[PDB]
């Protein structure tokens, strides 16, 4: 997640529900990380980003396992 448009609507859903957001991604760099830290420091948006554990197919398997365990869906 590195672009503005790839991170804003998830943050909008999290901000419209008053509930914290945890991103588990391959990486969160670029402008998306700046948006995350700006919304965390200024207004106090509850959010945190974390890299995806695993290399290669193990990363895909572990992300799918986390999505099934939390009831979410793997993006991209």
């Amino acid at each position: 997640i590195s672009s503005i448009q790839s991170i804003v609507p998830a943050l909008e859903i999290a901000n419209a529900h008053r509930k914290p957001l945890v991103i588990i991604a391959e990486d969160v760099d670029g402008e998306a990380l700046s948006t995350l830290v700006l919304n965390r420091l200024k207004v106090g948006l509850q959010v945190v980003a974390v890299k995806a554990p695993g290399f290669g197919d193990n990363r895909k398997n572990q992300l799918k396992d986390m999505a099934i365990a939390t009831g979410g869906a793997v993006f991209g």
Binding site: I4, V8, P9, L11, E12, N15, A16, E31, S34, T35, L38, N39, K42, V43, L45
Partner: protein, 100 residues
């Protein structure tokens, strides 16, 4: 042509100012300053008399002062008037007009 804060564009040049960049989205997510690109929406603050298209008459520009216009991506000239930023385009380089 019409001058704006004691500046009159020459020939078929249009002086505009861009609309303010969006700081926050509709949800409420604060946007960062670096990621905000150049706003292609502008309002016309000054116009020139025009160029000569044919023989014996002046050809005026197609926008008026106060018109809301859509800027192109490349083709603006930096003008600093009273420590405020302004951009100079040609009349034919303006893509369109937000009529109301």
């Amino acid at each position: 042509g019409q001058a704006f804060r004691k500046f009159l564009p020459l020939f078929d040049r249009v002086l505009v100012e861009r609309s303010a960049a969006e700081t926050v989205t509709k949800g409420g997510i604060m946007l960062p300053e670096k990621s905000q690109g150049k706003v292609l929406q502008a309002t016309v603050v000054a116009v020139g008399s025009g160029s000569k298209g044919k023989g014996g008459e002046i050809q005026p520009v197609s926008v008026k002062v106060g018109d809301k216009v859509l800027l192109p991506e490349y083709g603006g000239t930096k003008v600093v008037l009273d420590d405020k930023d302004y951009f100079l385009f040609r009349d034919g380089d303006i893509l369109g007009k937000y009529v109301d």
